[PDB]
Amino acid sequence: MREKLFWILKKYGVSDHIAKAFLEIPREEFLTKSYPLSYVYEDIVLVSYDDGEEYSTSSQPSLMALFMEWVGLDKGMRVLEIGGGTGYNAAVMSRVVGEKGLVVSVEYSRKICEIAKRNVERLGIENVIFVCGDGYYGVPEFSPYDVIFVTVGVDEVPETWFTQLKEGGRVIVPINLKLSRRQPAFLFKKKDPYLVGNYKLETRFITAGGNLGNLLERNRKLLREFPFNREILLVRSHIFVELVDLLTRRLTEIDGTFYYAGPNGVVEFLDDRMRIYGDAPEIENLLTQWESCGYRSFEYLMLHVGYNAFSHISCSI
Amino acid sequence: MREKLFWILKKYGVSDHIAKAFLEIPREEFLTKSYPLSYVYEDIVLVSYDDGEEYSTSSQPSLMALFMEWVGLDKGMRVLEIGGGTGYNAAVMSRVVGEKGLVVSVEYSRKICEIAKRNVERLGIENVIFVCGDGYYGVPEFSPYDVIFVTVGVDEVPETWFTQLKEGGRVIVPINLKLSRRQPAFLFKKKDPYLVGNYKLETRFITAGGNLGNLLERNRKLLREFPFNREILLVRSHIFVELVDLLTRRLTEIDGTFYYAGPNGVVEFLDDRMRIYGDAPEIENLLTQWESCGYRSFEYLMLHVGYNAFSHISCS
């Protein structure tokens, strides 16, 4: 029953206003497959749709509640959810933001998105708008948003989301760190022209398709030919490459060699060494900042992701 | 007369092969308005043309001789002269490079250029080619050049000249500084992808027209909209802005405020600080290097002007 889930969330430290949201939405109405109710209200992930071709899951309730607590989701806010699925999380967040708030959710699968629209209608929810398409583009018509809530692993936070986010808005997002076979989730706050934030924990969301899952491939198109400049010894190169992936969103690879596709140069990353073609002073700056921060991995650094500005690292503690 | 001029050039340390060229060219043949011969050979600037609307001047002989010495002008070289005027300096250099050398001289004024052509034609000087046009473009066909010899104040050394210059080639050039309104002359040597050089002395030349005199206006068109990033305080801002003018050649201005029009951002220069819109790590690096070099002005620094590369400052 919903009561047990509500209680379990309270035990997790989830506040009353967010926990109450989970008490008001019947999770079973979002599952296309029948499960015993005792299973429906367990704090676990549930397959919500599976036809052999397409698949979707309802996320672990406590993780979603934590995400909501972390971004400070509350009454009257406007949220852009990426990876709506059959709609359960969107429905829960709709109760959190209340009647004056709004939830816009994007689902890439046409079939799954249509099922979500139906579920929203069946439950009589009037403040949840589902959009069927690639979350990469966001939904500018209903921006600005207070929060960008991502429930699918994405290669990057596209500039679209940044532009659609209010100054001071938050982004909770699981990033596909494919080069390390990991999915770290981060919490960012917008302070134009940056998203400033920190790593939170490892997550297990479905990996995104479309333009939210082909960044390496897309960035190959950004590569240009530049004359060789110089080489620089690089310690813990893999750790730095992870940081370039997260901070620049311009990392790509050709034949297994990773390259930063810069606007004025290309940086080829090798085993504890990097070759610079053209100019990439922004990469030299990240390296200096990283060195000043003890060469620690991304989990222990404050990230300043620039939009129409280069990125930087800080570790003031 | 020319005999006195020669003696003076020698007294200034000018080599014999260069000073001798001044004994072979009649300066009076390049002046359209008669002057007493005793004045013609004084070591000064003379008005060589003036129809009331347009005018040109023959530069100070010793300054030209020094320029020649500094770029190592010698026999068989190919020189691109910018700002040919009525042709006197081109003619003198033609003697230095000899029958096997060549002087390609560009003059922007159609009338003055025609006069220059008539002058070398009349004197039978055959290794001088005058081009009537904007020196901004140089003259690709006759490159590679050993030397680019500039005799007019220019806003920048365009990439065209860099491309047309041999590796190891030299450029002697007076640059129109946008802020201080001075015309310091610099000696550069090409070491792809840079022109590496140093300030030599302050000069006074006619300020170039065409694309060699409208850099601020051209760069204003390169400005783009970028979000405010951050503000950076700095001391001796004017000194730094002049270095940005010289090293980046991307300076512009609107209503008296100078801006660096960068590829990825715009830097607004204020009296005691600069505001960065978008990003300009290349400026951030020049700033750090300048501060490292003691916040000194361009006269004391080694400039590495990049072409298809960002620039750098050194002070070894």
Ligand SMILES: Nc1ncnc2c1ncn2[C@@H]1O[C@H](CSCC[C@H](N)C(=O)O)[C@@H](O)[C@H]1O
């Ligand atoms: N590029 C892209 N844009 C928008 N949605 C995507 C996507 N790639 C994947 N997805 C979707 O993201 C989803 C995440 S699982 C659904 C979690 C959802 N918040 C709920 O409450 O059920 C899947 O349904 C999947 O098809």
Ligand SMILES: Nc1ncnc2c1ncn2[C@@H]1O[C@H](CSCC[C@H](N)C(=O)O)[C@@H](O)[C@H]1O
């Ligand atoms: N963009 C441009 N390209 C080539 N010449 C230019 C110019 N702008 C100005 N000039 C010219 O540069 C000249 C400099 S005065 C001439 C010095 C000349 N070497 C001589 O011996 O007389 C003037 O004739 C002037 O018209």
Ligand SMILES: [Cl-]
């Ligand atoms: Cl490949």
Ligand SMILES: [Cl-]
């Ligand atoms: Cl591949």
Ligand SMILES: [Cl-]
């Ligand atoms: Cl670089």
Ligand SMILES: [Cl-]
């Ligand atoms: Cl560099």
Ligand SMILES: [Cl-]
């Ligand atoms: Cl930077």
Ligand SMILES: [Cl-]
């Ligand atoms: Cl100053």
Ligand SMILES: [Cl-]
């Ligand atoms: Cl001052």
Ligand SMILES: [Cl-]
């Ligand atoms: Cl910055």
Ligand SMILES: [Cl-]
């Ligand atoms: Cl520098």
Ligand SMILES: [Cl-]
């Ligand atoms: Cl340097």
